[PDB]
Each structure stands twice: as C-alpha cells, then as structure tokens.
Design a protein around this ligand. Structure first.
Ligand SMILES: [Cl-]
Ligand SMILES: [K+]
Length: 118
C-alpha cells in the first residue's frame, strides 16, 4: 500500500483492546492525538497515512480527536498539545513527538522515534 488510514480510537476500553492486540504481536503502535480545528493536525494526516503504509503489518497507526473522544481517553495519553504523536508498546507510552511545525519535518522526527523502538 501507498497509504493506510489511521484507525480512530473510540474510548479507553478500545485503547485497552488495541494494546492487548499489540502485545500479542509484540509490536508497538502509533497514536496521533489531534483536534479538527488544529490546522497542523489536519495537514499532517496524509503524511502520517503515507508513513503508516511504510509500516504496514509492522506497526498499526491510530488517531484520536481530543474533542470528540471521552475525556478519560485523552487522560490516558496525558495530552497537553496537538498534534501529539505517541509510540506505545507493552501497554504504555514509550515516547512522543509534538508537532506544531512543517508536517514533513514532524514525520522525520516520528520516523526516528519509530526506529528507536521497533
Ligand atoms: Cl473512556
Ligand atoms: K503532556
């Protein structure tokens, strides 16, 4: 694939199931914590979906709209800024990247993070 759609996270129970599945596969996941009014979040989406395709079958990518999902789910990420791109593994956040600058450059920093933990 050239692009893979990020899967939305519905709530904290969904995150729990996502992390159980990642554990079964011994894989990390990526979560894009974003907001629909956040212009950089919107511009990052296609670039994240291109990066997700590069990791198809190796790292699943997810997204969560911090205004739409329950507050309890946002608290699981300890989010304070958007977009926040987190790598989780073994049931917890291992590292994150804060966007808020050109999408390509955020992606390269996310790629470095993935290289560290994959
Ligand atoms: Cl929840
Ligand atoms: K934070």
């Amino acid at each position: 694939p050239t692009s893979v759609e990020m899967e939305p996270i519905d709530d904290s129970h969904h995150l729990d199931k996502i992390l159980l599945q990642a554990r079964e596969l011994s894989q990390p996941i990526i979560i894009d914590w974003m907001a629909s009014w956040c212009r950089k979040c919107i511009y990052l989406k296609p670039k994240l979906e291109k990066l997700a395709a590069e990791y198809d079958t190796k790292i699943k990518f997810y997204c969560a709209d911090v205004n739409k999902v329950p507050q309890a789910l946002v608290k699981r990420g300890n989010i304070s800024k958007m977009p926040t791109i987190q790598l989780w593994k073994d049931g917890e956040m291992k590292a994150e990247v804060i966007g808020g600058h050109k999408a390509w450059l955020v992606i390269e920093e996310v790629r470095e993070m993935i290289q560290k933990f994959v």
